[PDB]
Amino acid sequence: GMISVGPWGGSGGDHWSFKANHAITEILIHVKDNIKSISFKDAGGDISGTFGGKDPRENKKGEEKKIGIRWPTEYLKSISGSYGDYNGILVIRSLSFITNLTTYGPFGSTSGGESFSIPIADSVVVGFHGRAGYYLDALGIFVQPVPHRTISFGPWGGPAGDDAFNFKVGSWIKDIIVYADATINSIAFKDADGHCEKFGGQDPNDIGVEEKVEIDGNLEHLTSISGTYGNYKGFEVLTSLSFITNVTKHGPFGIASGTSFSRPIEGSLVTGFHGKGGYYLDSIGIYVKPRDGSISIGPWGGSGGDPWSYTANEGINQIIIYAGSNIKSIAFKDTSGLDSATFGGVNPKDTGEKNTVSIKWPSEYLTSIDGTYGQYKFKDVFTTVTSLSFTTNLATYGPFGKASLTSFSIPIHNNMVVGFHGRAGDYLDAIGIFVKPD
Amino acid sequence: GMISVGPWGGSGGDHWSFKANHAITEILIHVKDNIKSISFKDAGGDISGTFGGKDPRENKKGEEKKIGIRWPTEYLKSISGSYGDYNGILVIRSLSFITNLTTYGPFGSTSGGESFSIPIADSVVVGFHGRAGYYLDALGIFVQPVPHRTISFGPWGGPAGDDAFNFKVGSWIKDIIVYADATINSIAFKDADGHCEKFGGQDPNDIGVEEKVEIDGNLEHLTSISGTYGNYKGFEVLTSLSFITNVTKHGPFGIASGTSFSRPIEGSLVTGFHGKGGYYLDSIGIYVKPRDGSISIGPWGGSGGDPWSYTANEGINQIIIYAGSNIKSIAFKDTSGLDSATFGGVNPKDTGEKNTVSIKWPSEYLTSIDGTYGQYKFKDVFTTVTSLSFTTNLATYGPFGKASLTSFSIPIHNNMVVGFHGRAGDYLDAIGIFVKPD
Ligand SMILES: CO[C@H]1O[C@H](CO)[C@@H](O)[C@H](O)[C@@H]1O
Ligand SMILES: CO[C@H]1O[C@H](CO)[C@@H](O)[C@H](O)[C@@H]1O
Ligand SMILES: CO[C@H]1O[C@H](CO)[C@@H](O)[C@H](O)[C@@H]1O
Ligand SMILES: CO[C@H]1O[C@H](CO)[C@@H](O)[C@H](O)[C@@H]1O
Ligand SMILES: CO[C@H]1O[C@H](CO)[C@@H](O)[C@H](O)[C@@H]1O
Numbered sequence A, B: 001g002m003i004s005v006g007p008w009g010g011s012g013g014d015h016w017s018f019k020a021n022h023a024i025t026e027i028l029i030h031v032k033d034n035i036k037s038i039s040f041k042d043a044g045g046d047i048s049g050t051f052g053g054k055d056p057r058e059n060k061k062g063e064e065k066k067i068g069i070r071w072p073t074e075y076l077k078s079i080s081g082s083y084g085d086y087n088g089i090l091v092i093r094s095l096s097f098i099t100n101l102t103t104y105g106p107f108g109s110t111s112g113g114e115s116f117s118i119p120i121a122d123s124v125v126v127g128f129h130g131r132a133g134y135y136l137d138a139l140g141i142f143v144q145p146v147p148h149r150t151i152s153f154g155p156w157g158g159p160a161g162d163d164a165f166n167f168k169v170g171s172w173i174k175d176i177i178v179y180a181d182a183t184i185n186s187i188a189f190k191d192a193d194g195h196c197e198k199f200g201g202q203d204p205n206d207i208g209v210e211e212k213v214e215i216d217g218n219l220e221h222l223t224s225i226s227g228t229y230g231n232y233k234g235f236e237v238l239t240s241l242s243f244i245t246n247v248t249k250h251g252p253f254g255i256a257s258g259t260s261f262s263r264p265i266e267g268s269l270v271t272g273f274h275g276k277g278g279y280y281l282d283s284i285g286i287y288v289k290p291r292d293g294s295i296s297i298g299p300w301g302g303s304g305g306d307p308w309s310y311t312a313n314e315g316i317n318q319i320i321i322y323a324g325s326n327i328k329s330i331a332f333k334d335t336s337g338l339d340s341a342t343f344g345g346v347n348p349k350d351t352g353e354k355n356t357v358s359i360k361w362p363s364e365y366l367t368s369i370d371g372t373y374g375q376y377k378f379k380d381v382f383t384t385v386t387s388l389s390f391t392t393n394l395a396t397y398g399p400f401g402k403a404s405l406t407s408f409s410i411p412i413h414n415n416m417v418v419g420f421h422g423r424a425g426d427y428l429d430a431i432g433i434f435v436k437p438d
């Protein structure tokens, strides 16, 4: 799917939204003291309508400018501009067009209003939305990641923090653990699977107070964040935060001081975080995916273990499986480097042997899994997956482990596997798949 | 999905295409001796761009007309108009807007060009496409069926034929059997499943010559038809036909005489036919679905029987199952009356007892099936489905038949069943499902 950003400007005129089928290669504007109208052309040569330009007065036509994007080598990544009063109406006064190579603009008046910019990385502008009548009341963008990347916002805060962090998750962000009083002392995260995370919080003299947010991820999801950054005991840091969902706002935690950051985004899901800490939380950014469903099959195996799941962002490239007389652990690698956790293998005295499956994406993609489950006894008796195999549109890989009496398979066709789920602890208790058509 | 119709007009200007998110409620045009520009508004209040209107000369602005569609009671169903030369260019000269209540127009010059109209029923205009620069070079429409209906084109030919026919299929049109020499004598059709069909061909003195078209329906599909109608031995009938695919044109069969009909359509699949015959083929029309994939699961059962499949057009409402100590036959009813054939039950001495499942669509929809298969002996020993049950998001229905040793089920979630497939002869040899997410 795509993430919406903005729109910036007024609430007059009529709403419009133009998603280009191919890359945006041309923007035409008419502009004088403000932007009278805008239209787009795409790589295959389709034009959008002309949005705005409806003032009947000849003076008020403005001048035509054409911005050409030199596809396929140049691609639009972002915009900047300004909005303000024009003869009484809150309107887009100027625009810039931000490419991977350069900036076209600014076009229109940069005086008499308020500017905007976007703290975004790794995006491609795939469309626009906004408002118009006589003029361009409002404008915002639609974005997708550049190939094999994930759109980034931020980071906000200071340039300090000796312990940097990045990660992304294949499922959702489920628990957030924050310490704070005067500022944000530290931040940690618990992936739906129970895999945890941590940051900041290294001042023995300023520890703050713990708060816990559980995101109830079937109905609720983390869509964005807001907060504040400012000078704290000399350091430029993040001083408050709030975790924003479709259901509610969790927080704010901390103390709002310095400068507020918000992000006008819609259609987003926060899959990850990046930034730096130390004594406190110097900086933080987010990774977002489009709130783009899978069918779910299984899981097969025992009742033990913590639930886990993994959905590839792009397409699953690799599977790492540890086996002995049962399956010990399993992990996934996708084409865009979004590794999954290792599910299982928590006991260092029983981790078995490594096996690997390679899948030649895109011409090869996973079709299903097969296997057995049964009882395995180590220090205690468990019912877990004991053997596993995988099928692609081209081949079968595996088997791995030791077959037991109870077997499972799926006579499925015209699909692709887009992720896995199950339960795991010391071992892979249970496993199933997520599939989509085609 | 949606079916494209047209565009009509010239090949100058730039291409554009606007699919409205909600119903089209307004069309604005600028027009003088031709249509200078066009734009649309939708029920939620989004506007499209203004397509055309780029002539810099003030004379050449044209006059604004607004056509309001009185949603939700009035909906646009079609258009008509004309194209012809305007100062040197092949261009839309006039337009009409065809609603379920009335016609708005005509707007522009009806002289000096060529008109078009659309032999269409049961459609809703959901968008437009076309071409523009200074003016409206070209215009075509996007259509979807009105709810619970199927878009119809035609019929073409005469008003005579005492034996009318209609049908639609849930899978594809696989074999076409035509008799013809001077005209089309008769036409018959063989559904992918092997279910046959027939028409015309009742003149003992004029039988024509048989021709057979098999549509190789995995890669090839029937997208449209063309042909000719004219006076034949006094009767106005269809005198030639061709069956048009994405791979090739099959035919023309017969003799081209009278008037040629074609249909400018894209994105279509012919799911059905309607019209009338007698001695010969008086008339014929088509039903088309948007060339909108399902995942396929199973089938479970024996190797015997002819393959069959069924995909609901809307959502499956009812299941009729005949059972004894095995399953005899199964058939489906969907919400839009697209019944499926009966699969199985060909032997009148072994048809067992009727059972029925009702599903309360949309809040109830099928989730999966369960059952057994085994050996059944009547006049000969068969391996067929012997028992069946169905699950919805709400309940389980069945079981029906007599359970045997070998059982089958699918631990599947977050899906819906959108059709069935398998094999059948005298009985239901084998059965599986087609599923989609959500
Ligand atoms: C001329 O007035 C119209 O156009 C402007 C934008 O051009 C809107 O702000 C306003 O609400 C009207 O729709
Ligand atoms: C106390 O110093 C540490 O912590 C602060 C933030 O608390 C960072 O700016 C600094 O680089 C060190 O990592
Ligand atoms: C060692 O115990 C853990 O691991 C097994 C599977 O290995 C699970 O059944 C159990 O619930 C715990 O999570
Ligand atoms: C003025 O010329 C332009 O516009 C017309 C339609 O307005 C096109 O036919 C032509 O090819 C150019 O694109
Ligand atoms: C011979 O008459 C029959 O056949 C012709 C077409 O062949 C029909 O027009 C007519 O109504 C009868 O059904």
Ligand SMILES: CO[C@H]1O[C@H](CO)[C@@H](O)[C@H](O)[C@@H]1O
Pocket: B303, B304, B305, B306, B382, B384, B424, B425, B426, B427, B428, B429
């Ligand atoms: C009576 O024979 C037919 O029916 C059975 C199932 O009923 C099939 O196995 C067989 O191939 C024929 O189609």
